[PDB]
Design a protein around this nucleic acid. Sequence first.
DNA 1: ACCGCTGCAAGGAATAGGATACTTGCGGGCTATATGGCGGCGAATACCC
RNA 2: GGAGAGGUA
DNA 3: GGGTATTCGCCGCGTACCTCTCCTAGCCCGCAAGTATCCTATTCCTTGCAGCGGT
Length: 389
Amino acid sequence: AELLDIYAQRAAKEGFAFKHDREQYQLFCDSFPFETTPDQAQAINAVLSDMCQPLAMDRLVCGDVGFGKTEVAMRAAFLAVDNHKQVAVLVPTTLLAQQHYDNFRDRFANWPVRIEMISRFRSAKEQTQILAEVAEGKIDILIGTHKLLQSDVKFKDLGLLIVDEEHRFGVRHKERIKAMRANVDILTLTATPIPRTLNMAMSGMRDLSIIATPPARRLAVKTFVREYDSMVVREAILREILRGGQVYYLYNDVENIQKAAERLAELVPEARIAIGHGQMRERELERVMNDFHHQRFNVLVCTTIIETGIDIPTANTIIIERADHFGLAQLHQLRGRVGRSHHQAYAWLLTPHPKAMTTDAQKRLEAIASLEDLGAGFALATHDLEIRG
DNA sequence: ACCGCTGCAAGGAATAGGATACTTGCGGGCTATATGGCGGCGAATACCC
RNA sequence: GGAGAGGUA
DNA sequence: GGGTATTCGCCGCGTACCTCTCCTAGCCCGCAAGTATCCTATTCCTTGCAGCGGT
Ligand SMILES: Nc1ncnc2c1ncn2[C@@H]1O[C@H](COP(=O)(O)OP(=O)(O)O)[C@@H](O)[C@H]1O
Ligand code: BEF
């Protein structure tokens, strides 16, 4: 009955056709100072052909982290601004939202087009101005979190929508963003699908694509599943400090993180530490993110806001503290978030007492330890299927 | 004497764990179709006048 | 209490 | 009617003792036990409205 309200098998849509100029797109390729992997090229060809088709997309590009997936979005946005179709981008954070903001600014500091962000960082006074500008269409590239899906943003011609890290998103988020215009091209970027989406990809009802081709210098990431030792963490911190890198410290607490920062400072007097949590006024958060870009302090304690990831090649090691309750997707994503460089990264994993571990925690840890190699996220997602169900 | 700010609830994503509705085999409690034995004898038909 | 089987004189 | 033959069915078949076993069938409804499921918590994130210093 619900579908009979639409009077179609999800088929009342006619879609849209994009026009691409081969020379213009080739010029944008020239503005990209890199060479894409063959599977990245295949994904580019598939997405460009699909948008050239007069139908709307729902395409999964589920490849492992560190495979330059974002550049596919960069080129999609370039072809969107070629048509001037008011592209919007969604990510469930502010850190990676800022990362995408600056990346798009870099991609379009040569191409005349307007890129901006709308999130908690912006004041409402300028949020209203952003909404007015996107109502008149003077803005083409917007980056922001769920503020857009609050029945407040107005688009003269909403023609392209982008979503990153489909995981951690509840249902009806995609429906709320779809409600505005049916024939918009949906580009679903992600690192790992949740079981339902992966099963639907298997069904073939949604377009799917995989990029099993890592960059040249992306060597593996070492992993070490160890019991709670206060010395391995210190010596690994020193190992990366002598290397000249940044350590990602995970503890997953917003109360004892304060004490833990000074505790690990006493453990490692050589370490310069900043304190990070999502319950902060965000001014010092962006300031210390800038500091991290400058690597003035080495090791950062943080909650799961780090999961989205703005990894710098300088960072080459992650030490966690809680290893009893974390999903396999998160484990693999934070494993692969490190790197983007020629240098061998590391992933030091700290576990509390083995007998305090429940059976499922043992299964998760043994599974993540069993597999350690490139192109491991997709197979890990397949294994997570039949586990989470 | 008006305002933008902080802060304090309401609703999304990840784990453990008891309650409790659901399913099942029973134990006692109850109700309701033959075929290898003769002999004697008296009554009951059959019969053919 | 009643049936069935075997046995003794 | 009547004297007769033929058939049908009922009646009957020793006394005393010892050992052993087994004695209605089937349905049905309460009921004990065992279980899969559903609601109950914890941790993270991003909103929406009421106080509130400050001027
Ligand atoms: N084929 C390649 N060769 C060398 N470096 C690459 C290649 N593809 C991507 N990179 C680099 O690796 C980084 C990966 O970042 P990102 O696009 O966020 O990857 P992912 O989205 O998979 O995490 C990019 O910033 C880019 O500079
Ligand atoms: F979206 Be990614 F993994 F940078």
